[PDB]
């Protein structure tokens, strides 16, 4: 995995199995963070 | 990444209930979800349930919803499926399946998987 462009913006492509684990479907809101060096992001 | 050993099966009369085992060994850390799959006679393998080993989420089919029910015991590196209600379409050969990578597939198909047990055989009679 790698960060890429998406439009003129980074972007970071979630595996479906990493969806289905957190229960996320498209749109769903997330919130991201920075913690221990490490970007976290949780379901809303 | 992982060995795979099934046990439980066993035949069992309709409308009973079953409790299959799997135990894996190896680099048990490194698994990321499990999950069962199963092949009636003479029909493709289909995945019935899956669960992600971080935080005990589920997923069901919808052929088994409400009926099986998948759990884990991460200090043994076990994952289980209950069966209520069984039903004589349920009679197949029940395989276990890990996966070491957060693969881009569902968890309820083969293709998002690595390892693979041998499979136990559950019999429902009519």
């Known amino acids: 995995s790698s960060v890429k462009r998406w439009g003129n913006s980074p972007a970071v492509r979630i595996p479906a199995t990493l969806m289905q684990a957190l229960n996320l479907n498209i749109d769903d809101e997330v919130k991201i963070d920075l913690v221990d060096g490490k970007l976290i992001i949780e379901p809303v | 990444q992982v060995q795979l050993v099934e046990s439980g099966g066993g035949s069992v009369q309709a409308g009973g209930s079953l409790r299959l085992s799997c135990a894996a060994s190896?680099?048990?850390?490194?698994?990321?979800?499990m999950g069962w799959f199963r092949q009636a006679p003479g029909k493709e393998r289909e995945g019935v349930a899956a669960?992600?080993?971080?935080?005990?989420?589920?997923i069901y089919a919808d052929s088994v919803q409400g009926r099986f029910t998948i759990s884990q015991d991460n200090a043994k590196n076990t994952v289980y499926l209950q069966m209520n209600s069984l039903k004589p379409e349920d009679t197949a050969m029940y395989y276990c399946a890990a996966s070491s990578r957060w693969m881009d597939y569902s968890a309820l198909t083969a293709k998002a998987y690595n390892s693979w047990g041998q499979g136990t055989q559950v019999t429902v009679s009519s």
């Open positions: 669960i992600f080993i971080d935080n005990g989420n589920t």
């Open positions: 190896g680099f048990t850390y490194s698994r990321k979800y």
